[PDB]
Amino acid sequence: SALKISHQFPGGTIKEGDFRDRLVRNFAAEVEKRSKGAMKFEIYPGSSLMKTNAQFSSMRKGALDMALIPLSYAGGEVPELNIGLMPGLVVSYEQAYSWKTKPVGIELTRVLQEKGIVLISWIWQAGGVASRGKPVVEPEDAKGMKIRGGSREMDMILKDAGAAVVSLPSNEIYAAMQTGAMDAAMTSSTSFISFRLEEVAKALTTGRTGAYWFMFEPLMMSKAIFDKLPKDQRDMLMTVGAEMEKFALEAAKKDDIDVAAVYQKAGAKVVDLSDGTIKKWQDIARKTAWKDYGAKNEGCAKLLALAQQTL
Questions:
Q1: Is 167 annotated as a binding residue?
Q2: Is 190 annotated as a binding residue?
Q3: What residues bind malonate, as annotated?
């Protein structure tokens, strides 16, 4: 009877923890209240219900009700979704959130619908780089290193910079860094904190003065499940879903700053990015990743063109 919400991030409470976990708990509490109990939820944090990379497909097939997942993890199955992490196309939170109802966001929403997924909450997150050695700041700093970029397109950028790449969901970063299976890892500010990567890295490059890495990590629902609910319940999910976006923006921005103090206190070298450095990474994107993405299929070509209209 309860609707399940699955995600890969640590569990906590509404008041304290990884904001993505907080957000789904807030979402559930408000929908329950407003629906006067017609809908109830159960939260499965930390991949406790199923593996990270099984969630998206499970929603498509109607076997999982809801999940909060980095969207581009599904880019292997639906190439259009690789736009969820591709530097240069998203340059700021304001621009990223403005996508939602601009042509690019409507298009992305409709692509997801055709694949059996409804977008409940837009969530964008700036990132950075934790390194087992020297800070990774400039693209040239990546040369010769093994780095987890986080998506196909971040990884193509890293290859152009001369890094080797490692692919894994972010809940698997800690173990890989600890054993020296990689040299550095990119992820969100929030994940740098909630996966405690300060324990396994000596340096952090932050997004305090800007970032090139912005990942889309929306709350999603199975369309099949969603569609079978009464209209008023569908609309309440969509209403509360939209309301969570303000929380997501504030929480991400707070973690973008707080992560610096966490790593500093742990004894890590902590550095920020200049606008020029950010541009270097974005320029590499325009010449490598953008081509890879846009030429993949007609849907990617369209999304890329529509995303470019927002720059």
A1: no
A2: yes
A3: 20, 73, 148, 170, 187-191, 217
